[PDB]
Chains A and B, each alone.
Chain A
Amino acid sequence: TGLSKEELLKVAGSPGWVRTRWALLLLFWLGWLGMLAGAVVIIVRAPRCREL
């Protein structure tokens, strides 16, 4: 209940959708690299363990 392969490639191959899809891909991937930078910051900022 949607576009066929034929109907999709006739619309979603437009340069506006190609640039949008590139933007979403890089937005996600920089977002994941940001979330890892966030975790690496917390792991440095956290109080280190008492020695034994």
Chain B
Amino acid sequence: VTLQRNITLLNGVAIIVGTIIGSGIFVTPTGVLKEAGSPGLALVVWAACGVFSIVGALCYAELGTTISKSGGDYAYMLEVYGSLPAFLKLWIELLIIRPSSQYIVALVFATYLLKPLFPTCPVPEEAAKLVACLCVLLLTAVNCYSVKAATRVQDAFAAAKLLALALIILLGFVQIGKGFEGTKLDVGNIVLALYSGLFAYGGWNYLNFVTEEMINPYRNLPLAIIISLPIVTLVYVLTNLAYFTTLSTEQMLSSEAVAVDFGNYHLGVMSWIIPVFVGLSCFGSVNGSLFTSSRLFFVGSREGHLPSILSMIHPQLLTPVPSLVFTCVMTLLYAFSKDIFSVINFFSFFNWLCVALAIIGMIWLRHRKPELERPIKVNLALPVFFILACLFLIAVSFWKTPVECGIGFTIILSGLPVYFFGVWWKNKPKWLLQGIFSTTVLCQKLMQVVPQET
């Protein structure tokens, strides 16, 4: 009954390049430039975030081939920090990180897909919410019917967005063939350039949620990482180079949608292709996140942190139906948010703190338990550099934003009530246990799902 391994190297590369390339290179090129002030520093933070991602991702290839459980960051945290730290990690991802980031790339899909019906005015907000929801629902249904559907969908749209980024880079090369740094340099401000840039690289850790579903993890996990992130970094610096050949700083700082202005300038009567490809680029990422998000919660239920129905599988299709239906519904609740793009600050803070704790754990476990196998081992310097870097980024951004970060810690600490109630302190009237069981078997009867075995 347990999930079949069927992710190849190519479908794992499609998961990473598909899920990273995403929205950030279309919706956020303005975001770094507004903090970095000039193309010479802006195009540099695009490379710097690439490097920090590459060394962090290789660090995840060591950690992943070491421990080889699925559930990624959460699993690797449980093997080092134990039950409560791992639960708080997962509770942040259950409530905010994987719901909000999915609804963020879904709103961008809806907005840029509809944009050629409404050039030079706002797209109707309620239609942009419905088409964001239609995307999440249809990709939940595809991801429930077959992993050989959802991986082919990932391949399809990972190809599509790289063709689109090739057009954008090519039109950049055409322009510079046809034929500077006034900078607001401040350590208290360049950090928000970096936090803007890294959001566009977020996803190098996503293949670590499907290690128990790849056909040969000890080869294909570390190979898919190191094939993927150099491609992403190259595509991103060349794409920014293209935007800065076409547009002035004042245009990019004041325009709502940089790829649309780029399209308008280069393609005229044919300009609608660029909006549609930004759409198709987001759609691929909603899939890659529903894929890897459902597997995280499935692992969190298997290892006893999350209610039992989420661990179950539909035996005729071998898809984790209750987990997909939950991560879907949890994403659609973000439709009741007005200024949802605000949550990218909370996303940026919460994510690299969890990766920091994971890589602190990578060093700690290699010293504390040296007998565990290391099918790839790279260095002891890359972990140390990544830890001091991410802890700098966290400490400095916290220091500049105590009012926002303070309320942020209440999201973290909201887990302790639920942890004690469900996991550990375990209030247990026998009527409550009879109700939880009755509710679970009712959900089994609806979805036709059976628990995971051996």
Interface residues of A (CB under 8 A from B): 1-5, 8, 11-12, 17, 20-21, 24, 28-29, 32, 35-36, 38-39, 42-43, 46, 48-50, 52
Say which residue of A3, A20, A29, A46 sits within 8 Å of B127 (CB atoms).
A46
Closest residue of chain B to A6 (Cβ to Cβ) is: B450
Apart from A1-B308, A5-B450, 10 more pairs, CB < 8 Å: A1-B437, A3-B441, A5-B453, A8-B444, A32-B138, A32-B141, A36-B134, A39-B127, A42-B124, A52-B120
B309 at the interface (CB under 8 A from A): yes
Q: B9-17, B111-119, B247-255, B368-376: which one contacts chain A?
A: B111-119
Task: State the total of A-B contacts with C-beta under 8 angstroms.
Answer: 71
Closest residue of chain A to B120 (Cβ to Cβ) is: A49
A42 and B132 CA atoms in complex are apart in Å by 14
* Interface residue total, chain B, C-beta cutoff 8 A: 33
| B445 close to A42 (CB less than 8 A) | no
Closest residue of chain A to B453 (Cβ to Cβ) is: A5
Q: Which of B420-440 contact A (CB under 8 A)?
A: 436-437, 440
B221 at the interface (CB under 8 A from A): no
A50 and B119 CA atoms in complex are apart in Å by 9
| B446 close to A35 (CB less than 8 A) | no
| B131 close to A49 (CB less than 8 A) | no
Q: Tell me what chain A mostly uses at the interface: helix, strand, loop, or mixed.
A: helix
How far in angstroms is the closest Cβ of chain B from A39? Answer: 4
How far in angstroms is the closest Cβ of chain A from B37? Answer: 31
Chain B residue numbers with a CB within 8 Å of A20 are: 446
Question: Given that A1-B437, A8-B444 are contacting pairs, would A46 and B124 also be in contact in the complex, using a CB cutoff of 8 Å?
Answer: yes
Question: Given that A17-B445, A50-B121 are contacting pairs, would A2 and B134 also be in contact in the complex, using a CB cutoff of 8 Å?
Answer: no
